Amino acid sequence: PMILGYWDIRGLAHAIRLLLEYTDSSYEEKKYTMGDAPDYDRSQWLNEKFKLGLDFPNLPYLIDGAHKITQSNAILCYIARKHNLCGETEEEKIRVDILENQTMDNHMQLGMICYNPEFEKLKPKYLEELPEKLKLYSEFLGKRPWFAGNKITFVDFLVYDVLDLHRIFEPKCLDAFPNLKDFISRFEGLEKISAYMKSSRFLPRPVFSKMAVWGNK
Amino acid sequence: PMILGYWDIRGLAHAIRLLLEYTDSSYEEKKYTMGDAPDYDRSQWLNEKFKLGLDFPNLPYLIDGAHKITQSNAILCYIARKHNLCGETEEEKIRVDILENQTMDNHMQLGMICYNPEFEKLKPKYLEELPEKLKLYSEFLGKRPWFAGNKITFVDFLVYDVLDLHRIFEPKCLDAFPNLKDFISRFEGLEKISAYMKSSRFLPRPVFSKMAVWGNK
Ligand SMILES: CCCCCCCC[C@@H]([C@@H](CCCCCCCC(=O)O)SC[C@H](NC(=O)CC[C@H](N)C(=O)O)C(=O)NCC(=O)O)[N+](=O)[O-]
Ligand SMILES: CCCCCCCC[C@@H]([C@@H](CCCCCCCC(=O)O)SC[C@H](NC(=O)CC[C@H](N)C(=O)O)C(=O)NCC(=O)O)[N+](=O)[O-]
């Protein structure tokens, strides 16, 4: 069994958890609990942070035998390589590469306003730009069933996560993009994905850690 | 010829420029000049931002025939795929994947304190953590000639950019890590890399855009 180590939140591990479930990967989760305010005790993680053999210790981390991987996108790429979910044509690889980085940027942008204490002042400005960001995703997808082409790749798990987070934040934001709504439906309708969302292992909340102004609970 | 579009600064294009030079890639650069304070006029880019056919318009961008790529890591991966600089074994790919993301995180951390107006208050705290960060790179490299193994990969260009920026910021930071200094020497000693650094095309400064508190000039 692989070990997925991360906080007891959704955060950056959501797509890793979904990709593990979809690939029928045998795994165990090591969950770290963060303390409440004002200290936000990370001692549970910080004590074993340098005792795991990680090259650049960080959460999330995946231990799969001899391989100890950090960086959420690197963990996703590792799992996707085992089950051929990386794209085959050069066009597919370009789409995967762009999206892997683009979704990270969109997740960071949301996370920055959510972790800022002036979240209430920044929120309306973020909401004005949100339709423009979502429009790029709607357009890039187009008539395709999946984001890289006709086959599902790990970037579909990343795009789904960004779309789901924005629908948690602003529920009406996907209403203008029918193909984005259809993509969420198609992704959630996958047999393993559907089973995992009904199970007890499913952890859709909290969206961020206890230190966030939005999504801490 | 491929077209590399980016601001007239070093920024996120430094490793792309170096990788293009090392691979003997035929390319042209489209440089966008940002205006001075307080407006910081990005009209040169904003006018043709939606007229290039880019799926997710951004700087840097690479146009190579039918392929229009955005996201610096995606551009690097595209070029590296053409010249087999992505890693062959699974161990090498894991190293490349970790580093591609890890170097992006280190670049973002330096960029966040350099774009913050309280740069002078944040700088000493960032300098206390810097030895710990550099130690991880020194330990990950070990006795290897390159970061992924014995062969040079595109992540060596990314790591070099991170190390070089930190030595521009605090010059004595690499003195404690002899193998990191040796890596810089070995990377800069490559025939194409050495030739490009002596040429007029070389753009090592400004480190960041005009809006940055540090590295704007
Ligand atoms: C606020 C920072 C910018 C927005 C971040 C958006 C995503 C947030 C993530 C993260 C929360 C970040 C908190 C920032 C500081 C908040 C306090 C303030 O406000 O100063 S969780 C994972 C986080 N690891 C990474 O960030 C390594 C990311 C790497 N590229 C990857 O993808 O693996 C962690 O817990 N590390 C433990 C450790 O270092 O030992 N999450 O989901 O909670
Ligand atoms: C705010 C934290 C600091 C930014 C992170 C540090 C790296 C900086 C980069 C950047 C400068 C940004 C600085 C912002 C500052 C704000 C200030 C304030 O409003 O408060 S490159 C230029 C930038 N490109 C990206 O961001 C593409 C990133 C992508 N993940 C990749 O890897 O392609 C751009 O302009 N693109 C055209 C567009 O606008 O769409 N650089 O090297 O100059």
Kindly report the CATH number assigned to the domain that includes residue A52: 3.40.30.10
Residue A143 — φ and ψ, nearest 5°?
Answer: -90, 0
A91 and A180 share one domain: yes
Question: What is the per-residue DSSP string for A158-203?
Answer: HHHHHHHHHHHH-GGGGTT-HHHHHHHHHHHTSHHHHHHHHSSS--
Taking the CA of B32 as reference, the closest ligand is 2
Whether B62 is in the pocket of ligand 2, judged by its Cβ within 6 Å, is no
**A100 in the same domain as A159:** yes
Q: Which residues pair with B69 in a beta bridge?
A: B62
On whether both B208 and B122 belong to a single domain, the answer is no
Q: Report the distance separating Cα B86 and Cα B80, nearest Å.
A: 6
DSSP for B60-89, written as a single string: SEEEETTEEEESHHHHHHHHHHHTT-S-SS
How far is it, in rounded angstroms, from Cα B90 to Cα B103? 20
* CA nearest to A137, candidates B193, B56, B201: B56
Query: Rounded to the nearest 10 degrees, how much is the dihedral formed by the CA atoms of B209, B210, B216, B217?
Result: 110
Mutate which: B56, B116, B153, vs A, most A CBs within 10 A: B56
Find, among A125, A76, A132, A133, the residue nearest to A107 by Cα: A133
Q: A101: which chain B residues are within 8 Å (Cβ-Cβ)?
A: 71-74
Distance, in Å, from the CA atom of A19 to the CA atom of A84, rounded to the nearest integer, reads 12
Specify whether A216 is located in the same domain as A184. Answer: no
Q: What is the DSSP letter of B54?
A: -
Which of B74, B102, B139 shows the shortest C-beta gap to A71?
B102
Residues A101 and A79 in one domain: no
Residue B138 and residue B119 in one domain: yes
Domain range enclosing B207:
1-85+191-217
Report the gap between the CA of A200 and the closest CA in chain B (Å): 31
Query: How many independent structural domains does chain A possess?
Result: 2
- Experimental method reported for this structure: X-ray
Q: For helices A178-188 and A191-198, give the axis angle rounded to 10 degrees.
A: 80
Please tell me the distance from the alpha carbon of residue B101 to that of residue A70, in angstroms, as a whole number: 9
Q: Are residues B2 and B67 in the same domain?
A: yes
CA dihedral A143, A164, A166, A96 (to 10 degrees): -50
Where do we find the tokens 């300098």?
B127
Largest CA distance in chain B: 50
Q: Are residues B22 and B109 in the same domain?
A: no
Q: What is the Cα–Cα distance from B43 to A11, expressed in whole angstroms? A: 36
The CATH number linked to A147 is: 1.20.1050.10
The verdict on A70 touching B (C-beta cutoff 8 Å) is yes
Query: Over the Cα atoms of chain A, what is R_g?
Result: 17
Residues B31 and B54 in one domain: yes
Based on the fold, state whether residues B12 and B76 are members of the same structural domain.
Answer: yes
Q: Which residues contact A49 (CB under 8 A, 6 or more apart)?
A: A57
Ligand nearest to the CA of A54: 1
**And the tokens for B203?**
């753009």
Instruction: Note whether B9 and B23 are same-domain residues.
Output: yes
Q: For residues B47 and B61, state if they share a domain.
A: yes
> How many Cβ atoms are within 10 Å of A27's Cβ, its own excluded?
17
Most informative mutation of B100, B113, B209, B210 for ligand 2 (most atoms within 8 A of CB): B209
CB B56 within 8 A of CB A98: yes
Report the residue among B7, B44, B59, B113 best suited for mutation to probe ligand 2: largest number of ligand atoms under 8 A from its CB.
Answer: B59
**B89 — contact with chain A (CB < 8 Å)?**
no
Interface test with B, best of A95, A97, A100 (most B CBs within 10 A): A97
Rounded to the nearest 5°, which phi and psi values hold at A62? Answer: -125, 125
B103-111, Cβ contacts within 8 angstroms, sequence gap of 24 or more: B103/B155, B103/B158, B103/B159, B103/B161, B103/B162, B104/B73, B104/B158, B105/A71, B106/B133, B106/B162, B107/B12, B107/B161, B107/B162, B107/B165, B110/B165, B110/B166, B110/B169, B111/B208, B111/B212
Indicate whether residue A13 lines ligand 1 (CB < 6 A).
Answer: no
List the B67-70 sheet strands across, edge first: B27-32, B2-7, B61-64, B67-70
d(CA B74, CA B76): 5
